[PDB]
Design a protein around this ligand. Structure first.
Ligand SMILES: [Cu+]
Length: 99
């Protein structure tokens, strides 16, 4: 699944922001508008036992040019909440369910 970082009207949103995937499916997060952006999984809001660091950018890491990507595959089933650290309070958050 492809996810835009920033909407095409400049909105600080993941597009889509809520979605479901299967195990091992890749998510390609693509810098689109309003960057810098990153993608950080919430360590307290992912499936027990998952290492947030294996699936996240650090908070200090950034994608800061248009078209740059962050790719991640998820395997463990369950709900994963994530956010863009510099834009979180603006509402740039999401949740992916692996089912
Ligand atoms: Cu962002």
């Amino acid at each position: 699944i492809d996810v835009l970082l920033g909407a095409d009207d400049g909105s600080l949103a993941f597009v889509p922001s809520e979605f479901s995937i299967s195990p091992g499916e890749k998510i390609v997060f693509k810098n689109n508008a309003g960057f810098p952006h990153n993608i950080v999984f919430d360590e307290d809001s992912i499936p027990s036992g998952v290492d947030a660091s294996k699936i996240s950018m650090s908070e200090e890491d950034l994608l800061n040019a248009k078209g740059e990507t962050f790719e991640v595959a998820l395997s463990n089933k369950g709900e994963y909440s994530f956010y863009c650290s510099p834009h979180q309070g603006a509402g740039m958050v999401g949740k992916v369910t692996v089912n």
